[PDB]
Amino acid sequence: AFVCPAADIKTTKCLGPKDCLYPSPKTCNGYIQCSPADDSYLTGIIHEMPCPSGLLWNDNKKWCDWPENTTCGLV
Amino acid sequence: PAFVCPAADIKTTKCLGPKDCLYPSPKTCNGYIQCSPADDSYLTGIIHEMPCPSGLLWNDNKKWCDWPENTTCG
DSSP, rough: OOOOOHHHHHHHHTTSTTTTTTTTTTTTEEEEEEEESSOOOEHHHHHHEEETTOOOOEEEEEEEEGGGGGOOOOO | OOOOHHHHHHHHHHHHTTTTTTEOOOOSSSSEEEEOOOOOOOOEEEEEEEEOEEEETTEETEEEEOOGGGGGOO
């Protein structure tokens, strides 16, 4: 499986828009967001999030983006 | 008009979840606002004016940047 890396939750509290966002090792048509479990900010909960149809993850900008801009290498 | 992040949304969710504390931007359809708790009272928010990708528009129904046909803008 995948779990949330605790270091990111502890260090950032995922407060910034681009914090705690990651590529999905399972698809280019989505991503993973880690949410802090609670306001102790010690561990994270995994959310497998989709991109809109036709958009791919662009990890440079941590968003769903036009396919030409993708950072995803999965085939 | 100047935006204020809704206190009730911050207080109730602490903006923890993926779809929490996201709103339309009054400045553009090609973007949105994401609020982050400003302090440990969780009643006020820092405003992050976020763009959408080229040509795409906010869809407040799904709280994401989406194809223009699915917009809520206006």
